[PDB]
Symmetry: none
Subunit: 117 residues, 4 copies
Amino acid sequence: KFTIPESLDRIKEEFQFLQAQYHSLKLECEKLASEKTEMQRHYVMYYEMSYGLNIEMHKQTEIAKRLNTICAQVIPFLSQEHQQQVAQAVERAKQVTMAELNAIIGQQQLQAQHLSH
Amino acid sequence: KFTIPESLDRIKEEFQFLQAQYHSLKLECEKLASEKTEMQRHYVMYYEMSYGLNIEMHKQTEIAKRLNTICAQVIPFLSQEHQQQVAQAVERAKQVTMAELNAIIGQQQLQAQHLSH
Amino acid sequence: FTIPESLDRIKEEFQFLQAQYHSLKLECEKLASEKTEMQRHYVMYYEMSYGLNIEMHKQTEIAKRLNTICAQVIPFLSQEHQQQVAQAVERAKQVTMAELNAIIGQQQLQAQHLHGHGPPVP
Amino acid sequence: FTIPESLDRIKEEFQFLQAQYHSLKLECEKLASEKTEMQRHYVMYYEMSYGLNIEMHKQTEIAKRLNTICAQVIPFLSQEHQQQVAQAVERAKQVTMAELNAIIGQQQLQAQ
């Protein structure tokens, strides 16, 4: 008639179960925290990087314009035999293929490698 | 004497305490997951950004180079006063101050903000 | 079959068992007391029975002896005297239930000191 | 963080309590049987006491009467005869331990 030891052992079971589920969730949490933090460090890294890159990019863009404007302003004082040539020159100058890009990048990277001494 | 009930009720207390801890911790966990997800999003964003900005930076640098060479070649085939004029003009065109830059990036992001209504 | 109400159930059953043990305990004690009382009365009435046994067998023997003596002394008498005495003795060996109740009830009323041996049987 | 300990402790105390209840119950029941057996005996010796009392007083009375009529008959005898009968009656009312002992175990020593 006395359902005590079975009930108490049942309790031992489900307490231990709850405890286990807790600890599981806690480990999961700790992982989430770590991975989130590393993710954040990456985020900051490329944030700052994109920042500096942005600044230098705008810089070179403005320099490029200014040089072009200068060209557009020396052309009228230039002779019609020289005008056409330098016009075409500036035309193509504005065109940069992925091959050229890859070439100057690869070269200057190689330079950084060879200067890393 | 046997102090059962007194202890029995105690284990109930510790139990409800445990389940409470599980609940609150779970809420914290879900929040943390959302946060990490958002962090990852911005990581990949600033990454792709950094990439594009790198490529574009090298592009603009190359264009500026080419155009500067164009000027440095055209200028000696001009006038004496105009030769000096253009020389100084170019060597000043290379000069980009941080104030000017702040202005450029400003107007860029402001007009980006406005053109995208 | 919840978790908290489970613990409550545990308590309930335990308190129940505590109560049960208490009741059983006091019942066991009153029980033992009753036992010792019964034992006392037992020894008492056994011993009393031994006494009554001895006395009964004694008076029985004395009576038998005296009857024999009368039996032997009778044939010495006159014919009428013999009849009278024989009648007298065989009438003497007759006690009814009324007079037996009388002597018993009396000797009872005489044996008072403030014992037992009462005429009913409860 | 100290819950399984508690539970096993509860189990221990409960098992203790019920073991004690079992033992106390068994002892109680054996004691009950003993009490009842005794009661049987006390009843037995009660009714025995009753009967023994009745027969004791009956035989006592009979003895008294017979003695009285011996006393009645005696004075009508010759002197020597009177002395003999008086001595015999006198002796009769004297029962010794060996006599009554040998008498108590009569029914038993009277078989076949």
